[PDB]
Enzyme design. Structure first.
Site, mmCIF file in Angstrom:
data_model
loop_
_atom_site.group_PDB
_atom_site.id
_atom_site.type_symbol
_atom_site.label_atom_id
_atom_site.label_comp_id
_atom_site.label_asym_id
_atom_site.label_seq_id
_atom_site.Cartn_x
_atom_site.Cartn_y
_atom_site.Cartn_z
ATOM 1 N N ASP A 64 0.653 -1.404 -0.083
ATOM 2 C CA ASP A 64 0.007 0.082 0.006
ATOM 3 C C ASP A 64 0.690 1.254 -0.078
ATOM 4 O OD1 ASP A 64 -2.172 1.688 0.185
ATOM 5 O OD2 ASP A 64 -2.489 1.259 2.528
ATOM 6 N N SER A 123 -1.702 16.109 -12.105
ATOM 7 C CA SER A 123 -1.969 15.646 -13.330
ATOM 8 C C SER A 123 -1.903 16.844 -14.121
ATOM 9 C CB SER A 123 -2.988 14.585 -13.464
ATOM 10 O OG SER A 123 -2.993 14.343 -14.799
HETATM 11 C C1 LIG Z 1 -2.601 6.780 8.314
HETATM 12 C C2 LIG Z 1 -4.201 6.580 7.558
HETATM 13 C C3 LIG Z 1 -4.041 6.522 6.010
HETATM 14 C C4 LIG Z 1 -4.138 8.095 5.542
HETATM 15 C C5 LIG Z 1 -5.159 5.706 5.491
HETATM 16 N N1 LIG Z 1 -4.859 5.517 3.996
HETATM 17 C C6 LIG Z 1 -6.171 5.151 3.250
HETATM 18 O O1 LIG Z 1 -6.946 4.930 3.961
HETATM 19 C C7 LIG Z 1 -5.905 4.812 1.841
HETATM 20 P P1 LIG Z 1 -5.480 3.325 1.672
HETATM 21 O O2 LIG Z 1 -4.967 3.070 0.085
HETATM 22 O O3 LIG Z 1 -4.298 2.890 2.633
HETATM 23 C C8 LIG Z 1 -6.793 2.043 2.038
HETATM 24 C C9 LIG Z 1 -6.043 0.469 2.067
HETATM 25 C C10 LIG Z 1 -7.207 -0.462 2.184
HETATM 26 C C11 LIG Z 1 -6.700 -1.754 2.430
HETATM 27 C C12 LIG Z 1 -8.216 -0.284 3.569
HETATM 28 N N2 LIG Z 1 -7.951 1.822 1.208
HETATM 29 C C13 LIG Z 1 -8.923 2.355 1.454
HETATM 30 O O4 LIG Z 1 -9.333 2.687 2.279
HETATM 31 C C14 LIG Z 1 -10.024 2.226 0.267
HETATM 32 C C15 LIG Z 1 -11.491 2.955 0.512
HETATM 33 C C16 LIG Z 1 -11.187 4.308 0.298
HETATM 34 C C17 LIG Z 1 -9.927 5.054 0.336
HETATM 35 N N3 LIG Z 1 -10.040 6.401 0.061
HETATM 36 C C18 LIG Z 1 -11.333 6.827 0.167
HETATM 37 N N4 LIG Z 1 -12.044 5.491 0.344
HETATM 38 N N5 LIG Z 1 -10.435 0.742 0.006
HETATM 39 C C19 LIG Z 1 -10.473 0.265 -1.345
HETATM 40 O O5 LIG Z 1 -10.328 0.837 -2.339
HETATM 41 C C20 LIG Z 1 -10.932 -1.169 -1.370
HETATM 42 C C21 LIG Z 1 -9.463 -1.847 -1.272
HETATM 43 C C22 LIG Z 1 -9.844 -3.591 -0.946
HETATM 44 C C23 LIG Z 1 -10.565 -4.346 -1.662
HETATM 45 C C24 LIG Z 1 -10.860 -5.606 -1.340
HETATM 46 C C25 LIG Z 1 -10.103 -6.189 -0.314
HETATM 47 C C26 LIG Z 1 -9.341 -5.342 0.518
HETATM 48 C C27 LIG Z 1 -9.390 -4.015 0.298
HETATM 49 N N6 LIG Z 1 -11.580 -1.521 -2.769
HETATM 50 C C28 LIG Z 1 -12.977 -1.137 -2.674
HETATM 51 O O6 LIG Z 1 -13.403 -0.399 -1.787
HETATM 52 O O7 LIG Z 1 -13.391 -1.395 -3.860
HETATM 53 C C29 LIG Z 1 -14.731 -1.006 -4.424
HETATM 54 C C30 LIG Z 1 -15.125 0.212 -4.357
HETATM 55 C C31 LIG Z 1 -15.019 -1.902 -5.389
HETATM 56 C C32 LIG Z 1 -15.663 -1.789 -2.954
#
Ligand SMILES: CC[C@H](C)CNC(=O)CP(=O)(O)[C@H](CC(C)C)NC(=O)[C@H](Cc1c[nH]c[nH+]1)NC(=O)[C@H](Cc1ccccc1)NC(=O)OC(C)(C)C
Length: 330
Positions: A35, A199
């Site tokens: 990630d 971008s």
């Molecule tokens: C220290 C805090 C940081 C700033 C936190 N960072 C983040 O939340 C962004 P990230 O890329 O690390 C985080 C990692 C995930 C494994 C939880 N991704 C996310 O939180 C985003 C949701 C989001 C992000 N922004 C707005 N909404 N999740 C996603 O995009 C998940 C990824 C996934 C799919 C399947 C199995 C496991 C994981 N996919 C997903 O939601 O896909 C559909 C929209 C079709 C439901």
């Protein structure tokens, strides 16, 4: 030194990609979600509440001769989708595709949220954004990349994610056989702690490239491509059966349609995402309606260049003192 590891999609929709990681001595192989949108390396372990563990593979610090408990350190993180995890920390040897780092902080989950328990294929996450986002307290821990920089032949890592196929994550070297043309680099802002860039514009199908600044982040941990509401509306306006669906949560269209491509600019270069990468898949097995790969970032509060975007290119995360982001067509 260098490292090269194969990364594979967890399902037929390319929702996420997992890469094997060797933790401890002797090595304990866990499949982690690399990630670039987070900075914590955490895994399910012998310490996780039993009832919150599915069929994931766990890390048992007691079985590793090189594990060291980091006294007083604790961690707690919440992601964009609302999932979260927390626990304590150990330092141990971590290897990825032959590249070994000693004394790497491995965060041991004591509790995990429902979505993580529900995903049997993901054993934890390996954060690749800037160490400033690390949740360990009281002193933040460096990411696997920051710890490896000293021994890396070059302070870089590349992401070559596949479309419905395996890909590769390489550390310390750029594989010239993996892309076509040349790599175009763009400046990165570490103010928010992410691999943040701007971008130069976009184009829909075979129409005109519109010069407009799109500040977004390259995040391998997010599935989709989230752009400003007006840019997303311009894309969907080219698909006759497409509509915004309040019940499903975004733009949906007939699985039947042939989607136009989407081009994004990188400086003077142009990255073209094939229309088929934009067709994420049916909303339900057998449905005639499909979920769109490009959605509005209006509610996220930030543009995200997710997997749908990144998989159409060869991405170079250049971690030098002044980091940059490079993109090449492939
Ligand atoms: C220290 C805090 C940081 C700033 C936190 N960072 C983040 O939340 C962004 P990230 O890329 O690390 C985080 C990692 C995930 C494994 C939880 N991704 C996310 O939180 C985003 C949701 C989001 C992000 N922004 C707005 N909404 N999740 C996603 O995009 C998940 C990824 C996934 C799919 C399947 C199995 C496991 C994981 N996919 C997903 O939601 O896909 C559909 C929209 C079709 C439901």
């Amino acid at each position: 030194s260098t490292g090269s590891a194969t990364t594979t999609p967890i399902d037929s929709l390319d929702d996420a990609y997992i890469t094997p990681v060797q933790i401890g001595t002797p090595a304990q192989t866990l499949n982690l979600d690399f990630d670039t949108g987070s900075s914590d390396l955490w895994v399910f372990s012998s310490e996780t509440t039993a009832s919150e563990v599915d069929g994931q593979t766990i890390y048992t610090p007691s079985k590793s001769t090189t594990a060291k408990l980091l006294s007083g350190a604790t961690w707690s993180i919440s992601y964009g989708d609302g999932s979260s995890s927390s626990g304590d920390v150990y330092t141990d040897t971590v290897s990825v595709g032959g590249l070994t780092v000693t004394g790497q902080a491995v965060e041991s989950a004591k509790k995990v949220s429902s979505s993580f328990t529900e995903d049997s294929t993901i054993d934890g996450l390996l954060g690749l954004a800037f160490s400033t986002l690390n949740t360990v307290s009281p002193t933040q821990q460096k990411t696997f990349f920051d710890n490896a920089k000293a021994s890396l032949d070059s302070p870089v890592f590349t992401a070559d994610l596949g479309y419905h196929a395996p890909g590769t994550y390489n550390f310390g070297f750029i594989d010239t056989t993996a892309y076509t043309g040349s790599i175009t680099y763009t400046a990165v802002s570490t103010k928010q702690g992410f691999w943040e860039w701007t971008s130069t514009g976009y184009a829909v199908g075979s129409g005109t490239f519109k010069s407009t600044s799109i500040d977004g982040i390259a995040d391998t941990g997010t599935t989709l491509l989230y752009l400003p509401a007006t840019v997303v509306s311009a894309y969907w306006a080219q698909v006759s059966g497409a509509k915004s669906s309040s019940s499903v949560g975004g733009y949906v269209f007939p699985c039947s349609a042939t989607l136009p491509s989407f081009t994004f600019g990188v400086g003077s270069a142009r990255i073209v995402i094939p229309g088929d990468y934009i067709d994420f898949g049916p909303i339900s097995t057998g449905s005639s309606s499909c979920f769109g790969g490009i959605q509005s970032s209006a509610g996220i509060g930030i543009n995200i260049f997710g997997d749908v975007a990144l998989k159409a290119a060869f991405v170079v995360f250049n971690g030098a003192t002044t980091p940059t982001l490079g993109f090449a067509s492939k």
